[PDB]
Amino acid sequence: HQAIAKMRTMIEGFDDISHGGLPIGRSTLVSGTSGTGKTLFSIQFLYNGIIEFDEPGVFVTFEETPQDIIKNARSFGWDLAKLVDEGKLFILDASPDPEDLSALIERINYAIQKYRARRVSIDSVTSVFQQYDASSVVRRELFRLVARLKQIGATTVMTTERIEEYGPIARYGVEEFVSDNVVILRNVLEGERRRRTLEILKLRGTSHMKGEYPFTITDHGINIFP
Amino acid sequence: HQAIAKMRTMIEGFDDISHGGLPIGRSTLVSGTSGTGKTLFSIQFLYNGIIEFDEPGVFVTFEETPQDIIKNARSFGWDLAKLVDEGKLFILDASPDPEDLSALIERINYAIQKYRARRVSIDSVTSVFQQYDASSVVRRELFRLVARLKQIGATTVMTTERIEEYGPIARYGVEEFVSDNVVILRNVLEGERRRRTLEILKLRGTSHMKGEYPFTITDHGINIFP
Amino acid sequence: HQAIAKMRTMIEGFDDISHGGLPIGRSTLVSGTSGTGKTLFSIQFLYNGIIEFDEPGVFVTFEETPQDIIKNARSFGWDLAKLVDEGKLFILDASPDPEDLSALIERINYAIQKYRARRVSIDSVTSVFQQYDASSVVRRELFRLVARLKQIGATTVMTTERIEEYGPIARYGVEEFVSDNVVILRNVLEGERRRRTLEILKLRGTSHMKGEYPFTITDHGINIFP
Amino acid sequence: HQAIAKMRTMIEGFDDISHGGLPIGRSTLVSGTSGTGKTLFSIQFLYNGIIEFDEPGVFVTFEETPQDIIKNARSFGWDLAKLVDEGKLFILDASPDPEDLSALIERINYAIQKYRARRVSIDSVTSVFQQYDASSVVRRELFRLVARLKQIGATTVMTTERIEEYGPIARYGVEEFVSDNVVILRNVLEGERRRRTLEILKLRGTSHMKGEYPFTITDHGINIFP
Amino acid sequence: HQAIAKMRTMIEGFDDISHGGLPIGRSTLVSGTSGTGKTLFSIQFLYNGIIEFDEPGVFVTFEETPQDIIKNARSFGWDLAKLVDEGKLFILDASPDPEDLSALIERINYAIQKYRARRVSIDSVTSVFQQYDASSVVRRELFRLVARLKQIGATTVMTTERIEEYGPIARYGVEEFVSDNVVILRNVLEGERRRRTLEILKLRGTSHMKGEYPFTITDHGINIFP
Amino acid sequence: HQAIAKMRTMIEGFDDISHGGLPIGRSTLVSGTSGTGKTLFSIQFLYNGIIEFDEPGVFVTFEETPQDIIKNARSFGWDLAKLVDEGKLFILDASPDPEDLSALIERINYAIQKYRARRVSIDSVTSVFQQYDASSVVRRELFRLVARLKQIGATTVMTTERIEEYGPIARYGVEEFVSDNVVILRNVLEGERRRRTLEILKLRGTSHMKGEYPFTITDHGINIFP
Numbered sequence A, B, C, D, E, F: 001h002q003a004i005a006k007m008r009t010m011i012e013g014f015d016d017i018s019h020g021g022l023p024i025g026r027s028t029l030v031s032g033t034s035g036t037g038k039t040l041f042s043i044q045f046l047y048n049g050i051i052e053f054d055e056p057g058v059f060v061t062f063e064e065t066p067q068d069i070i071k072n073a074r075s076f077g078w079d080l081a082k083l084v085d086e087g088k089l090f091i092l093d094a095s096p097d098p099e100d101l102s103a104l105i106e107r108i109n110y111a112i113q114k115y116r117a118r119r120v121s122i123d124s125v126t127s128v129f130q131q132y133d134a135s136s137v138v139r140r141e142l143f144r145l146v147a148r149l150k151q152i153g154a155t156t157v158m159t160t161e162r163i164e165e166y167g168p169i170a171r172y173g174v175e176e177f178v179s180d181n182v183v184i185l186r187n188v189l190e191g192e193r194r195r196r197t198l199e200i201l202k203l204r205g206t207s208h209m210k211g212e213y214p215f216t217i218t219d220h221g222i223n224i225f226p
């Protein structure tokens, strides 16, 4: 009878195929090749949550400056600068200076406590994982991060990159099993045309729709057809 | 004339294709990609045994907290919290703290002696095996664990993860031969749709039905069509 | 005119496709994936020889206890316990304790001398070969073992495991050429059904039938259609 | 409403499929196998910019002498020697003598300051990256270079080589995600004929046309059909 | 006008597709998977030469005892024991004892001088090459052996083993280019049937027929259809 | 208007598909599997140049003795011995004795100065590159050699070997980009028949015909159909 509570991500059509959206408190992995729409997915999730439910979020990035994210959001019509100025949204800078996972998670926890945020998105933890070559270390650190996020209680959307359209759901192959949920974004080539597909392969402890559902990126956001 | 005794797992339709279910006292491997239904298979096996035959079980987990397992079971309608409180079911915690195989097998044996349990399920021994990179060490440790479980006399269902839908029956390729039985769970993609299949490739010392039999995961459990 | 003498293995239909069965005194390799019927093939060879020609055999195992082999044989109706008690069959234990190739071959020779056996079967020498990673060491040890078995004069059936259904005839790719004969057991999947095939690719110094011949495992043994 | 400003590259038909050309200030990756037209693409970009918008450019090369580039351009009818003499175009020599990324970026910045150039093209940074085998070092150095170029404010077109026509968008697989934009040049073989295709897979923060658009290299330049 | 002199191998039909047989004095490589007919090819070459042209030969073996070769030849009807006793044929033993390339080539040269032999066959030099893992060492040693054989003046048929039916013409991929000639023996599986094919891919300095020509192994020898 | 000057190679039909032949002064790579016709291509290029334009050439070889090259040429009807005796052609010996790139290039330069030769062919630089395993060292040495040859001013035809018919244009994958031009020789198998194809994938700074053009090796030379 009782089921895991879910929070609506307000993405057009995604809540229908997820049967209520992302579970509350669980860390959701999103994997896709370059140009699939991972960062846009996380940004749209955060912005829709902020606008609709008035729930502040914290966006963590490792390979983009906050100004670039603000410009990309302004391209769609999203004014993230106003949200950041008002304190309703916070963007964490962790990129290396062009000139320790404990520190990063401590900073994320401090941001959560200060801004009272209940949504978290990560641009890429693969950049952090590139420090350690061994897959055992990758699994250990990913599990530690997911456990810390579950203890904090924020709904995470960690996005990682994958090399092949069909095959491993990560660069290492271990990130598929550690994360509570995994969502696959595919950008395949068929007949000299690229068609975008969105598929959910697992949602632990709750039902979902299975298979590839096409989604088109428009000027307003991601439009998914259930 | 004489055959190996079998215990019914009470999974809908699985006993028909297994010709009596899992053999008694032998360790059964279950391999499947992410989202195939391995942990659900082991949990349903334990819970059906507990409810029907009143045989206590011990569930060993390495990547999930017991609370998460309880919530996932409650999603299906299974009240594992009551069973744990009554002492009829015990869940062993071996996950690393986010802050030696001899010890683990000793603890499992102690749990078996204390709770008088005759069924054992393992969430993932691959997490333990990730410590040792060499496949020889993996084979040695897996054989030691299987031999210890056979000496104890509990019916084990060890579940391990595999990378490719078609190919090795383990991440290493050695776990197919060491384990007494192997069961393959496949989640293939065909025509933008995912169809789940269940296949048994070997049951040493007893007959079985061979080939892919589709199984659908419903709110009550795993429904397999023989 | 003169040809290599052959001994009948009494397996249903195999003697027709082998043109007289295994050659006398030569070590025959049998390679197949998990669940193909390698151990059953060797056990049926030994038991049929013992029952028909009254020739004692020695079965060497590395990953199974003798009790498990006895139970598996009793499943088919073969009472190996009586044969072991009468001294007509001997099973050698070489598995590692869960708590040097010279020693193993010396023990096999001693068993041959004591029991006057003229048939030998090996469950898996791949378990021994896993100690040495280099393929040169594998080839050297395999050649030494085959030469020792030829000097002893017993008809060996060494069974090794292979990973892919189509491809190398061993985990290393060197065991195909060192062994005097090689027999391929295949368990392929086609249209969600598994069909078993038996093929002989070489029999040095004698003719044979070439190609895949289906064989079905029944409660009495292996039934092969020539 | 507001979008990222774009500068026209004046390549025939490319501005139609890019929806305004390359974004201003962002580093665009161009990946293609040998003989696809990467160096010709960068040279045509620079020369068209210089002729039309009177914007000086700086071409950085690592595997070709400036004389070879001048001869190749003269083949098409482009007189780069006059532009270099007049100071409107500068070619940077970084090739190893046949007899430190900080120095290279410092020299590029000095050239930008001296010649007041607002367009930059790179023949191959893969030659520099070949010094470091690890992909983490490649990602770090590529990100540092892209960040420095963004801080300078010049519109870069970095071209890197790829091995397979279908597969990774770089020799390492990491250069697809670090770069702000990626453009794929393909030279495929079908029916004993080679057909050239141009495809853009991502343009962060702006829309584009997706899919393979054939382009033919003529004596005047690259002719692309939108 | 002038061409490289050739010696007939007297194999049924092979001289037609080779346009005169193997060139005189050049070392011919023969590569094929297990069970293709490499050792039989070399033995038939030597025996046909001895019987027809009365030219003594020297057979060098590394993985078979001379007695096994004699028995295998007697299977076809070839009495190599009489030839060895009469001194018209010599078999060199180089296999490791089950209890330095300079020495081997010195022994081969001594055998050539003593028996006045003008034909040489090698069972497998891959067994020797397995000592050195690096492909550069393999190429160097193979070139040294071929140069020594050319200086001696004997017509060599070196046979090496290959793993895949389609792909490299050697286990290393370097033996295709060093050897003066290469002949490919294929044992492919198509529709559950094995069909044997013989193909010559290069004969330096002379013409040949190209493509796969089926050959069947009969009780008298190799029967090839040109 | 102005284009790169070209010299006719006088190969039947190749000048039509190359639009004037090889460029003057640039080093042309020729890659093909064993038995494709690389050495024959270089020898025919040199001999046709010598006979028609009276331009002396220098042939550099690493795996063949000059006598073998002379015999192979005499097979086609080419009397290279007379040319070598007259001093119109010089063959450089660099093969290792069966009993430093600076030295080799110095010797080639000395030969060019002594014989006033304006054409150079190389049998295989891959033999030299096998000393260094790393691909960075291979690229560096290949670039140094090509730069030295460009400074000398001789028209080079460097031939290297490739493993797969379809795939990398070299054993390492780096030789495709360093060389000024690359020509692919393919010997494919289709329907048990081998058909030879010649394709040019790039000619920097000049136009060419693209695609696979069949070429047949006859007793007089290479006959290519444009």
Ligand SMILES: Nc1ncnc2c1ncn2[C@@H]1O[C@H](COP(=O)(O)OP(=O)(O)OP(=O)(O)O)[C@@H](O)[C@H]1O
Pocket (backbone or CB within 6 Å): A033, A034, A035, A036, A037, A038, A039, A040, A041, A072, A075, A076, A161, A217, A218, A219, D176, D177, D178, D201, D202, D203, D204, D205, D206, D207, D208
């Ligand atoms: N305003 C827009 N309208 C339409 N499509 C857009 C718009 N802005 C961006 N896109 C699309 O975004 C895609 C990729 O941008 P995005 O921000 O999603 O990167 P990404 O795939 O997450 O990147 P990475 O792989 O580097 O992490 C492009 O293919 C482009 O078509």
Ligand SMILES: Nc1ncnc2c1ncn2[C@@H]1O[C@H](COP(=O)(O)OP(=O)(O)OP(=O)(O)O)[C@@H](O)[C@H]1O
Pocket (backbone or CB within 6 Å): A176, A177, A178, A201, A202, A203, A204, A205, A206, A207, A208, B033, B034, B035, B036, B037, B038, B039, B040, B041, B072, B075, B076, B161, B217, B218, B219
């Ligand atoms: N109540 C439910 N109704 C239907 N399907 C469910 C339900 N709960 C879970 N599932 C299914 O369970 C699948 C995976 O959950 P499960 O607990 O079996 O994980 P798993 O495959 O064992 O995980 P892992 O690979 O991480 O070990 C999902 O694809 C989802 O569809």
Ligand SMILES: Nc1ncnc2c1ncn2[C@@H]1O[C@H](COP(=O)(O)OP(=O)(O)OP(=O)(O)O)[C@@H](O)[C@H]1O
Pocket (backbone or CB within 6 Å): B176, B177, B178, B201, B202, B203, B204, B205, B206, B207, B208, C033, C034, C035, C036, C037, C038, C039, C040, C041, C072, C075, C076, C161, C217, C218, C219
């Ligand atoms: N009594 C029986 N009747 C029918 N089939 C049986 C019987 N006993 C065993 N089998 C078959 O035996 C097969 C595998 O058992 P077997 O003893 O041959 O193992 P194996 O393939 O040699 O093992 P491994 O790969 O671990 O060495 C199973 O697929 C099962 O169908």
Ligand SMILES: Nc1ncnc2c1ncn2[C@@H]1O[C@H](COP(=O)(O)OP(=O)(O)OP(=O)(O)O)[C@@H](O)[C@H]1O
Pocket (backbone or CB within 6 Å): D033, D034, D035, D036, D037, D038, D039, D040, D041, D072, D075, D076, D161, D217, D218, D219, F176, F177, F178, F201, F202, F203, F204, F205, F206, F207, F208
């Ligand atoms: N004048 C021309 N007319 C037509 N095609 C030309 C002309 N000049 C060059 N090309 C074409 O240029 C192609 C490759 O030259 P280019 O300068 O683009 O090299 P590239 O692909 O960038 O090189 P690399 O992979 O080494 O970096 C050739 O296939 C050739 O057909």
Ligand SMILES: Nc1ncnc2c1ncn2[C@@H]1O[C@H](COP(=O)(O)OP(=O)(O)OP(=O)(O)O)[C@@H](O)[C@H]1O
Pocket (backbone or CB within 6 Å): C176, C177, C178, C201, C202, C203, C204, C205, C206, C207, C208, E033, E034, E035, E036, E037, E038, E039, E040, E041, E072, E075, E076, E161, E217, E218, E219
């Ligand atoms: N008398 C015979 N009649 C027919 N076929 C025979 C006869 N003797 C041997 N063969 C064939 O020889 C084949 C292999 O034997 P052979 O001596 O050619 O080995 P090989 O392929 O050279 O061995 P390896 O790969 O170990 O070097 C078998 O497939 C068998 O069919």
Ligand SMILES: Nc1ncnc2c1ncn2[C@@H]1O[C@H](COP(=O)(O)OP(=O)(O)OP(=O)(O)O)[C@@H](O)[C@H]1O
Pocket (backbone or CB within 6 Å): E176, E177, E178, E201, E202, E203, E204, E205, E206, E207, E208, F033, F034, F035, F036, F037, F038, F039, F040, F041, F072, F075, F076, F161, F217, F218, F219
């Ligand atoms: N007189 C000839 N007539 C016809 N074909 C010939 C003649 N001489 C040689 N050949 C052909 O030459 C081909 C290979 O010889 P070639 O000298 O071209 O070697 P290659 O491919 O350059 O060698 P490698 O790969 O070892 O460098 C053979 O397939 C053969 O058919």
Ligand SMILES: [Mg+2]
Pocket (backbone or CB within 6 Å): A038, A039, A123, A124
């Ligand atoms: Mg991103």
Ligand SMILES: [Mg+2]
Pocket (backbone or CB within 6 Å): B038, B039, B123, B124
């Ligand atoms: Mg699990």
Ligand SMILES: [Mg+2]
Pocket (backbone or CB within 6 Å): C038, C039, C123, C124
């Ligand atoms: Mg076995």
Ligand SMILES: [Mg+2]
Pocket (backbone or CB within 6 Å): D038, D039, D123, D124
């Ligand atoms: Mg270039």
Ligand SMILES: [Mg+2]
Pocket (backbone or CB within 6 Å): E038, E039, E123, E124
């Ligand atoms: Mg042999």
Ligand SMILES: [Mg+2]
Pocket (backbone or CB within 6 Å): F038, F039, F123, F124
């Ligand atoms: Mg050559």
